[PDB]
Every structure is written in structure tokens, then in C-alpha cells.
Swiss-Prot record, chains A, B:
Gene symbol of the encoding locus: CYC1
Native species: Saccharomyces cerevisiae (strain ATCC 204508 / S288c) (Baker's yeast)
Protein name, per record: Cytochrome c isoform 1
Family indicated by similarity: Belongs to the cytochrome c family.
GO biological process: mitochondrial electron transport, cytochrome c to oxygen; mitochondrial electron transport, ubiquinol to cytochrome c
Additional remark text: Present with 7330 molecules/cell in log phase SD medium.
Keyword Transmembrane: no
Cofactor note: Binds 1 heme c group covalently per subunit.
PTM notes: Methylation may enhance its transport into mitochondria. Methylation occurs in fungi, plants, and some protozoa, but not in animals. The precise role of methylation at Lys-78 is unknown, but it seems to preclude pro-apoptotic activity, possibly by lowering affinity for APAF1.
Upper taxonomic lineage: Eukaryota, Fungi, Dikarya, Ascomycota, Saccharomycotina
Length: 108, 108
């Protein structure tokens, strides 16, 4: 399902405990590991002034709104280049086919 | 789409360069960061003798075959507990609603 208006008060606590380590939100606030998020809604992803992103922002692009940010926050790590390869991820279907054809024989 | 028989020879090289760092495949081979994979096809996930898994193996369970291992190898990290939370992931839809309701106000 989709976004439904919730508790800004609980959301303030979630931001402090889950986001502030890598993001500020106030206008003119500093970048950290992640970019300052002022004005994030209504602008496109990957364009904060003064911050340079991973290659994700030439592979993906959204106009942030409540719905697609809700989907994003289920698993932001999967959009970081390298996360999938870290524990053996194989982007190419043909590579997974080759690996599995081998593993079927090698593990028998 | 689904699994199609591929190149065991290319798959052998993929295993050596992408899997061997954390897995052995031979019968009686040692565990490493990950479990030995002998006999993996046809047994259920999360049951290698002598290895104790993350909580993933009480949340997820498959009978490994070519198809579901192909899906798994697109992104194994997303099944490791903690990966999603690491960069701000919020499992509960109500938490994402609360966060986003706050962020909409705080970032304006
Ligand atoms: C707490 C739940 C959050 C929220 C609401 C967001 N993050 Fe992060 N984030 C981090 C990094 C390194 C990036 C850039 C990624 C890249 O360059 O590929 C981001 C990006 C975002 C965005 C997109 C910003 C844009 O300008 O498009 C958004 C909306 C976002 N984040 C929200 C790093 C981190 C963390 C470091 C461990 C943590 C924790 C979070 N983010 C948590 C959150
Ligand atoms: C190279 C592409 C591969 C392949 C084919 C597999 N892996 Fe891994 N793996 C690792 C860990 C720590 C685990 C256990 C996770 C947990 O306890 O939650 C696994 C698990 C697997 C399985 C499931 C095994 C089972 O008994 O059900 C399979 C089929 C599998 N892997 C295949 C760790 C790593 C790595 C450490 C960085 C790397 C690299 C890989 N795995 C790569 C691969
Ligand atoms: O993988 C299967 C899914 O693919 C699509 O979902 C897309 C969505 O359509 C697509 O809009 C979404 O994009 C999210 C991009 C998030 C941008 C993150 C930015 C962060 C900072 C730097 C640049 C990137 O990615 C999803 C896949 O990861 C389909 O829409 C879904 O129906 C389908 O379930
Ligand atoms: O998230 C949306 C998707 O959900 C389902 O896909 C499931 C599959 O049905 C489901 O079979 C699959 O399970 C994979 C579990 C991999 C087990 C990994 C083990 C490794 C070692 C320790 C225990 C776990 O997880 C997928 C979701 O992550 C649906 O089937 C899909 O159609 C749908 O696109
Ligand atoms: Cl492809
Ligand atoms: Cl829920």
C-alpha cells in the first residue's frame, strides 16, 4: 500500500535516532556521510547543492514524494553500489545461470 | 524469468572469485564466514551441519533449487539482519509514515 499521514512527533524521534547520524535537515545545514535533506520533497534525487553522490544517481532518478520515499526507506542499502555484490550478488542473469550450473555439479 | 542451464566453466571461475572467500563446496569442507555448501541443492536453507546462522533462518525458509537460488543471488545482503536498517531502513510501514510525515515538515 501507500503513504498515509502519521505522527510527526514519533517521526521526529525516528529521525533523531535513525537518520541524524548521517543527515541534517535544516536549511543550510551541513552535509555528513549523507547529504543535507532540506527541500528534499519536490526536487529530484541526487542533486543537493555541494554534495557529490555515488553512481546511484546516474542509474536511478525519482522526484521525491511521500510514496516513493516510503518505498526507498524499506531498504536504502540496496541502492548503494556494492551492497549487492558484497555477499555474492550477481547482477547479470547469465552470471547467475553460470554460477548455479557449476554449483549444482560442484556441491553434489 | 527463470534459470537456464549455462556454462559450468564460467561458473567455476565466478565461484572462485566471488564465493570462495566465504564458502567451501567440497564434502567435508570447512565452514568460513559462511557455511560449507556441499549438498545445498535439495536440502532446506539454514541447516548445514556444524554451522549456526543469523536469525534469517527462522524468518525465511526455502528448499534450494536453481530458480530460488538465482533470485537469492541477485541480492543476498538483503536477507542478512541489519543490512536494511544500516542506511535508515524502517521495517514497519507505520514507522515510515511517521518519519515521512515529520520529514515533510522539517525539510520545508
Ligand atoms: C533515516 C530513516 C534516513 C532517512 C530519512 C534518509 N537517510 Fe540517507 N543517505 C546516506 C547516503 C550516504 C546517501 C547518499 C547515497 C548515494 O550517494 O548513493 C543518502 C541518501 C538519502 C536520500 C536521498 C537524498 C537525495 O538528495 O536524493 C534520502 C531521502 C535519505 N538518504 C533519507 C546515508 C545514510 C545513513 C548513513 C549510515 C543513514 C543512517 C541514513 N542515510 C538514514 C536516512
Ligand atoms: C557466491 C556468488 C556465493 C554464493 C553462491 C553463496 N554465497 Fe553466501 N553466505 C554468507 C553467509 C554469512 C551466509 C549465512 C547467512 C545467515 O546466517 O543468515 C551465507 C549463506 C549462503 C547460502 C545459504 C546456505 C544454507 O545453508 O542455506 C548460499 C546458497 C550461499 N550463501 C551462496 C557469506 C557470504 C560471503 C561473505 C562476504 C560471500 C562473498 C558469499 N556468501 C558469496 C556467496
Ligand atoms: O524490483 C522489482 C520492482 O521494480 C520496480 O520498482 C522500482 C521502482 O519503480 C523505482 O521507482 C525505484 O526507484 C527508487 C530509486 C531510489 C533513489 C535513491 C537515490 C538516493 C541518493 C542517490 C541516487 C539514488 O526502484 C524500484 C526497484 O528497486 C517496480 O516498480 C516494482 O513494481 C517492482 O516490484
Ligand atoms: O518483496 C516482493 C517479493 O516478495 C516475494 O518474493 C519472496 C519469495 O517468495 C521468497 O521465496 C524469497 O525467499 C528467499 C529466502 C532466501 C533464504 C536465504 C537463507 C540464507 C541463509 C540463512 C537463512 C536464509 O524472498 C522473496 C522476497 O524477498 C514474492 O514471491 C515476489 O513476487 C515479490 O516480488
Ligand atoms: Cl541481464
Ligand atoms: Cl507492517
Amino acid at each position: 500500500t501507500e503513504f498515509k499521514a502519521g505522527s510527526a512527533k514519533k517521526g521526529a524521534t525516528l529521525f533523531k535516532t535513525r537518520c541524524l547520524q548521517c543527515h541534517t535537515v535544516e536549511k543550510g545545514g551541513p552535509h555528513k556521510v549523507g547529504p543535507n535533506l532540506h527541500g528534499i520533497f519536490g526536487r529530484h534525487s541526487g542533486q543537493a547543492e555541494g554534495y557529490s553522490y555515488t553512481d546511484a544517481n546516474i542509474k536511478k532518478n525519482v522526484l521525491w514524494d511521500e510514496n516513493n520515499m516510503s518505498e526507498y526507506l524499506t531498504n536504502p542499502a540496496k541502492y548503494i553500489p556494492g551492497t549487492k555484490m558484497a555477499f555474492g550478488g550477481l547482477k547479470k542473469e547469465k552470471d547467475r545461470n553460470d554460477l548455479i550450473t557449476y554449483l549444482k555439479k560442484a556441491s553434489e
